[PDB]
């Protein structure tokens, strides 16, 4: 139970990925649906309108899944690298009643990326059964930029 759930393959459609906000610029759109592992092209990553700790990227599996981990990746423009260094994870069954992922009694601060191309895998112990998943960028270099994948398997 550690297979990609569909971010890179698109088994998870564009409509299923949303965010608190996303950055748009001349001839460019860093929309939520761009947050797919190893994606290439212009504006190939989700970026919030403004970088702050209250932004989030959301994935709706449209069904209950067993999530055993997440894979994060940064992004590089022509020369500058952008990536999330630390992030939190929250989950929900209805998309409104959210619970942060805790570890040993406290909210878990996951260690993310340190460059723009290396994928970093973070396992979830214990795993979670949820329909919705959110990534909360806490720290970053230059810009909050994300390309990701979710690891797990069917609940049934």
């Amino acid at each position, epitope marked *: 139970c550690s297979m990609p759930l569909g971010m890179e393959s698109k088994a998870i459609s564009d409509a299923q990925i949303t965010a608190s906000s996303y*950055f*748009t*610029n*001349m*001839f*460019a759109t860093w929309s939520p649906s761009k947050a797919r592992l190893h994606l290439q092209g*212009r504006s190939n990553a989700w970026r919030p*309108q*403004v*970088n702050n700790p209250k932004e989030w990227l959301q994935v709706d599996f449209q069904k209950t899944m067993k999530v055993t981990g997440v894979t994060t990746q940064g992004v590089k*423009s*022509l*020369l*500058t690298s*952008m990536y999330v260094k630390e992030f939190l994870i929250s989950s929900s069954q209805d998309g409104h009643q959210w619970t942060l992922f805790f570890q040993n009694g406290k909210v878990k601060v996951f260690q993310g990326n340190q460059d723009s191309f290396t994928p970093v895998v973070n396992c979830l112990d214990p795993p979670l059964l949820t329909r919705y998943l959110r990534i909360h960028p806490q720290s970053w270099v*230059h*810009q909050i930029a994300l390309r990701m994948e979710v690891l797990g398997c069917e609940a049934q």
Partner: antibody, heavy 117, light 108 residues
Framework: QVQLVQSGAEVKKPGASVKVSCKVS????????VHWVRQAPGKGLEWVGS????????IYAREFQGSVTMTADTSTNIAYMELSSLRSDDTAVYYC??????????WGQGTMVTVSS | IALTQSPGTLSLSPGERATLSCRAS???????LAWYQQKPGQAPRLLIY???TRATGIPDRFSGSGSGTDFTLTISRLEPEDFAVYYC?????????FGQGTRLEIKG
């Protein structure tokens, strides 16, 4: 290791047309938009227009609406900026620049264009 | 949207803290504000974008802040290499504009 190389200085008479080039190296032109700006002898920066070599879409600055034409040779990775109906007040250094990742991060060396009788 | 810079000419001494302002006609996202530095005979150099993010290679000496209609470029301790002309500007999906510029000279 990216570089934007513009064409040499131009000398033109009123009513003439000048075509400035901007060759990029280290990436495919189509991957990013191309911004154009100029600076008159003792004045500030002024946006002229921007172009998307991927779709061929252009957006002009209010003051340069009907005097600029932007194009690009996708194969040779060269962006072009043609200014027609040149006037003496069009005398300035013209620059191309691309975002990395959002503004005018990388600049060409600039092309001097002098318009006079 | 129009941008207004102040002062026209700022006179300070090396080692001093420099503060430059950029006022906008209408409020807009801080993620569309950039600051550039330009020295004679040279093309402009981007210092900060998104109002507060420094471009790679830019000394920690430079920092930016602000939002809405007021933005600020601050230089903690001025080095002789910092005396030049500074320009702010707003970019975006539909248009870009520049402030008129501020010249930072040495107080002699």
């Amino acid at each position: 290791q990216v570089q934007l190389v513009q064409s040499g200085a131009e000398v033109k008479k009123p009513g003439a047309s000048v075509k400035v080039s901007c060759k990029v190296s280290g990436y495919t032109l189509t991957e990013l938009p191309v911004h154009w700006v100029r600076q008159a002898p003792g004045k500030g920066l002024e946006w002229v227009g921007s172009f998307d070599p991927e779709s061929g879409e252009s957006i002009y600055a209010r003051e340069f609406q009907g005097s600029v034409t932007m194009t690009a040779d996708t194969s040779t990775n060269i962006a072009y900026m043609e200014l027609s109906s040149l006037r003496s007040d069009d005398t300035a250094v013209y620059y191309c620049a691309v975002p990395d990742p959002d503004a005018f991060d990388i600049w060409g060396q600039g092309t001097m264009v002098t318009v006079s009788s | 949207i129009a941008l207004t810079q102040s002062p026209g000419t700022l006179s300070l001494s090396p080692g001093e803290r420099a503060t430059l302002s950029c006022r906008a006609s209408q409020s807009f996202s801080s993620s569309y504000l950039a600051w550039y530095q330009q020295k004679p005979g040279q093309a402009p150099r981007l210092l900060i974008y998104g109002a507060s993010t420094r471009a790679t290679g830019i000394p920690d000496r430079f920092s930016g802040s602000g939002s809405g209609t007021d933005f600020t470029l601050t230089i903690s301790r001025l080095e002789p290499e910092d005396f030049a002309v500074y320009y702010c500007q707003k970019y975006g999906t539909s248009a870009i504009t520049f402030g008129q510029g501020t010249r930072l000279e040495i107080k002699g």
